[PDB]
Amino acid sequence: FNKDQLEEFKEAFELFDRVGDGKILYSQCGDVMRALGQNPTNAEVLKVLGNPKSDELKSRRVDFETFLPMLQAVAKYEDYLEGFRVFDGNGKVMGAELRHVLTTLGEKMTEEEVETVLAGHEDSNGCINYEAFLKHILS
Template sequence: MRWGIGAPKKTRVPPKTFSFSIPLSLCPNTPGPHGMWLPTKPNILIVLPPDYKEAFGLFDRVGDSKIAYEQVADMMRALGQNPTNKDVAKILGNPSAEEMSSKRLDFEGFLPMLQTVVNDPQKGTYDDYVEGLRVFDKEGNGTVMGAELRIVLSTLGEKMKEAEIDALMTGQEDENGCVNYEGVKRPAGGEPGSPGQEGEEGEERQNGGEERKSERREVE
């Protein structure tokens, strides 16, 4: 139990996050008052924040406490996951285009699907993305042309829509239309190899890009 500090009387303050895991033997069999239990690994549960269900409700455009199949991927991304549309279609049973727009899913049915995505070990790290972008770094200076990146995102692999690309690229291009992919800041608390931490590692990446650029010039 947590208590407010400096309060005139003892007041329970709900934890800010429920993203920790605890042994299954210590968990109740029903959802708690502040969140829902989501099994992730054998004998381990994760407690979902109560706002997960609220977020689910924001995707409900009909008012029946359900979302359309075609919204499931976006719902998972809104909750911090990054599944591909192909992954989600497989989890949903490979429905047809008509079923994607007509079939609906409630929150209780959505949770096991979210669990499947959370348990998926095939997740790209920050370094994976950097290495992928380095293929398009023709100058070896840690940047890629924004226009070229837009073409790649819209034509290769799981194609992104123009609006999605615009949202992704906003604020990323410099005055020359280049994206400094090696200088991307890692979010606070980001684990090694994931988007996020600033510091010596970011400086090393930038310095490494400058060194490669100098080496190329010397060779020329």
């Protein structure tokens, strides 16, 4: 990261500081990385965090300087499309099935999160153009 990048990242980090001490929680590190353009898994976030225990994940606070190596480590289309073609052959996917798999397998999200990202992308039949949805969520 260059000075400009370090300045933008520090400013963003400070936006996530909800206590004024210039720090975020470990549990916010993933959120900051995603807000800054990274897409780490929760497992990857915990790994770069050092697999913290519940107590320090929920209450231990870290400044930008300790977060930065973690952001670096996390930072360092056709597969995504085929991944969506998994759930396809008319180019559509049921909204119910995508909702079920996103809310029941893997690193489960909330139903509200899934509704939020899926809001406006399904038609009256309940089908999502997945090439468009993928481009949209990658934009």
